[PDB]
């Protein structure tokens, strides 16, 4: 899988809170987060099926 998707959910300084979600590969799982709404990173998807996708 991309190196991406071993990164840990990335917040940001923003104060949205919207639900994203982060492959967690340690655990093998899209798992949601809150997002501030800025600076995203790369592994930050709209869907738990995205996040798989791109990293399962």
């Known amino acids: ?3 991406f998707c ?5 917040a940001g300084p923003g104060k ?3 639900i ?12 949601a987060f809150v997002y501030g ?6 592994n930050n998807f709209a ?3 995205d996040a798989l996708a791109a990293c399962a």
């Open 1 to 3: 899988r991309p190196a």
């Open 6 to 10: 071993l990164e840990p959910p990335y």
């Open 16 to 18: 949205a809170r919207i």
């Open 20 to 31: 994203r979600y982060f492959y967690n590969a340690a655990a093998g799982a899209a798992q």
């Open 37 to 42: 709404g800025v600076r995203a990173k790369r």
């Open 47 to 49: 869907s738990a099926a």
